[model samples]
Target: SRRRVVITGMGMLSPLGLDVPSSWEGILAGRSGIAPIEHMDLSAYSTRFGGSVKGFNVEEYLSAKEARKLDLFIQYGLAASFQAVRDSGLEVTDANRERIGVSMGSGIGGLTNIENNCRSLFEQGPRRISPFFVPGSIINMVSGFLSIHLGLQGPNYALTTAQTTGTHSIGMAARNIAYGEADVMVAGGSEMAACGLGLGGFGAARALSTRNDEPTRASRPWDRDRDGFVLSDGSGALVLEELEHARARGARIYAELVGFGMSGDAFHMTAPPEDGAGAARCMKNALRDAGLDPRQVDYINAHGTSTPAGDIAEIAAVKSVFGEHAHALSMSSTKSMTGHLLGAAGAVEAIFSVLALRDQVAPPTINLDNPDEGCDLDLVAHEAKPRKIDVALSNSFGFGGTNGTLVFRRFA
Candidate 1:
């Protein structure tokens, strides 16, 4: 039989704040974290605002020399991972060191670093590139560095599925624990792609919001005026362990990861079908995996990035999967406040989902003044809603029509 897995610790660094408590407080208060891009010149770009992590001191998590060698994404990843490990209080002794692992990832790894190196090669010379460039920017380095730092000698890898990267990483880590590959796994995703090249590339693809005048109000998911997603940077990590292992160690349990499901659209490269067929399948698969009926779900942390089509498509998928129950369960997008964290979206949002289960409240979807025509579900708009939540679901859909869903149940 497959072993049971439960979340023991959670950590996050988001635009709203630097840690989990601050971010969750900002979320429940319906505050927006979007602001003008401060790291670079955006005079040539149409979108001038994003959800950038502020007041983060990389040296606080790593040595000065180590911090200079890594990109912001890896730094964010390590910060969250360290926080999670500390929160779990799992001692990495010699006997259990090999039983612990890491599964972290990023959607667009090292975009800023890659852009800078390319500039150095053109403007300066190839030899001007830093030796740490490759190690700093790669997606798997989060796992690699974490393993090396903590002496964890188990499974170590990363998945790169665009926006779904975080969700897939957490899901695969749970699978690893369930399959006896590891006893504990530090899993999540991180991203820092709000740089010049990232913004330009997304803007060129027409995938970002251009509401520069009112940055905070830009990421209004399900709102009629929403144009596109707001790019953001952040990271979220969770410590997952076998149920018996965690209990034996007297670890504080957050929630049980009951189901994980994945699917491919096989329809569009960057957009879902108008009817959200692929998304419905993904949710249904998760429910089936958890042996749950649609009516039993209490809340959903939607992949609602405020894109015109994506928002409506997710609503359509929810209605299809849950039928009448869709109107009863609350669904909200934290992206309405944090913007879209892209690669880190899934993990950060998953942490929010677990927090919701912990507190029995649904986070608000700010700026949802006027819902679109098809977005008629209970979206938990404008203000957080307190409710009895036993089971919660989180959704993540990426550029390649990849979809992932995670079902978490409150620990009794």
Candidate 2:
């Protein structure tokens, strides 16, 4: 049998707050972090706001010289990784350093640098581009930078599956540990793509909300008036360790990662299949992997991105997979408050799922006063609800018609 895996520690940097504890507190309090974009000019774009990560100082986590050599995404990633390692209290000695791995990802890595460097090449000549541009802008550098910081010599990996990137990183990291490739893995994702190119590109595609007058209310998932998702920038991390490794050190166990399932829509490039067959199969696969019955799942951290089609499709998928148990399950979208963190969505939302189990309370689907058609499930709308959760599933579906589901159970 494969080794069991559990979440030993977690870290986060998001629009809600700078760390996991603060973010969870904000989530339970039902707060919205979406606001007007101040880091860059958004006058030319249809959407003027995003869930920007506020009140972060890179100096607190990295040296001045080290900070300059990396992009913002990598910086955010390193910060989260350091926090996770610190929380886990895992000392990386020479004996175990090689057994500890890193799997951090970014869906749209270093967007700011790519756009800035290209602009410099066009206007001021290629000589104006910084020497760190190539290393800083690539997607894989999130894991590369994290491994260097922690001296993790094991499976250094990265995933770029758009919105599924964060969840997939954690899932695959657990797989690595179970398969004996590593004993511990720093797995999660980070993103700082709410820059001009990111916002402009999504805006051009009409994938972002244009509720310029009501920024906080823009990310209203399942609400009839929701136009699209709000773009956000942030990072989240989890330390996944073999159950034996964690128990040997008497480390704290947050929850057990029992299942991971992935599937392709094979239907569209950006939009989901109208019938949601692929999404339903993905959920079924996860339940099967966990050896769980549909009724055992108490809550779902939905992949509800607030898009008209996407939200409806997810509801259909849930209904299809859960069957008669659908009405009994509580589903909420923390994205309604954090906006969409793209590649980092899965990791951050996974943290929320663990938090749900920790506190025995389900976070609210805030701003869900007016539900649209097919959204008639127990959404735990408007306010956080107290519930004893045994199994919680975090779902992530990306633009490439990719879907991923993770099943986390309360630690026995």
Candidate 3:
């Protein structure tokens, strides 16, 4: 028999807040975290603002000397993982260490580190490159470092599926537990790509909002005025343990992970079809995996990135998958407040979905002033809505046409 998986703890570092509770509070209060890019001179870039994590101190999670050797993404991932481990009350003894693992990742891993090292190599020659450069900047190092730090010996790895990295990581981690490869896994994604090249690259692709004057208002999902998505940096982690293991340890359960599904658009690299067929298929697969009816899902944490095409396409997908029951479900994009966390977006939003099930509330899609055409679903707009959210689904679509959906049920 396949083992059951449940979320016992969640941790996050977002532009909105440093941890899950604070970030969720910001979401419920309808606050926007996007603002002017202060870390670099974005004078040449059309998009001058982004959702950058602020007031984060690496020393709190790692020693100052150790922090310098790791990229910002790894630091954020480790900090969030530590929070999840502690929150889950997981004891990492030698007896259980081999049964626990880590699955974390980043979309654009170590861009800032690469940029700095490239500058150093050009100006001071190849000898100037640091020896720890590769280890510090690679995508899998988040899992590697966390494993070494916590002495976990089972299945440590990371995924890099653009923005869907977090969902894929968490899903695969749950699979490991279900298959009896591990009893517990720290799974999620992290990203810190608000640097010079990071900003310039997204701007060059014309995928970011140019609402320079009103940074907070820039990430307005499903709004008539939304030009594009706001690039952001952060990390999110969840502790997924086997249900029996959790019960044995008396771990406080947050929600049960019921289903995970993935799909490929097979049409575009960065955009979904207007009909959203790929997304609809992905959602249907998740429901099938969960053995659920479309009408049974009570809430959705949308992959609404505030992009003009994506916003409408996602709504179309919802309508196709849920039919008339779409209007009965509460769907919202926490991205309206947190902007887009890139690879970390999926995991962070997954945490929000779990919290929504726990609290029986649907967090609002802030800044949805004027919904675009065909975006008429019950979006839970403007304010938090208290409701019966027994089951919540989180959707994530990435640039490579990669898509992922996760179903979470409130543990009764």
Q: Candidate 3, residue 66: CA error in Å?
A: 0.9
Q: Please list the Cα RMSD from the true structure of every candidate, rounded to 1 decimal place.
A: 0.7, 0.8, 0.7
Give the alpha carbon lDDT tens digit for every residue of 1-412 in model 2. Answer: 7999999999999999999989888999999999999988889889999999999999998889978878888889888888999999998989999999999998889888888888999999989999988987888887787787778899988999999999899999999999999999999999999788899999888899999999989999999999999999889999999999999999999999999999999998889987788889999999999999999999999988999899999999999999989999899999999999999999999999999999999999999979998789999898999997999999999988889999999997
lDDT of 1 at 353: 96
For residues 199-248, write the lDDT of model 1, one tens digit per residue. Answer: 99999989899999999999999999999999999999999999999999
- Give the alpha-carbon lDDT of every model: 0.94, 0.92, 0.93
lDDT of 3 by residue, 212-268 (tens): 999998988899999999999999999999999999999999999999999999989
TM-score of each: 0.99, 0.99, 0.99
- Model 1 lDDT at residue 365: 95
- Between 1 and 2, whose lDDT is larger? 1
Model 2 C-alpha lDDT versus the unseen true structure: 0.92
- What residue pairs clash in candidate 3, if any at all? none
Q: After superposition, how far is residue 130 of candidate 3 from its true place, in Å?
A: 0.9
- Residue 43, candidate 2: alpha-carbon lDDT: 94
Clashes of 1: 0
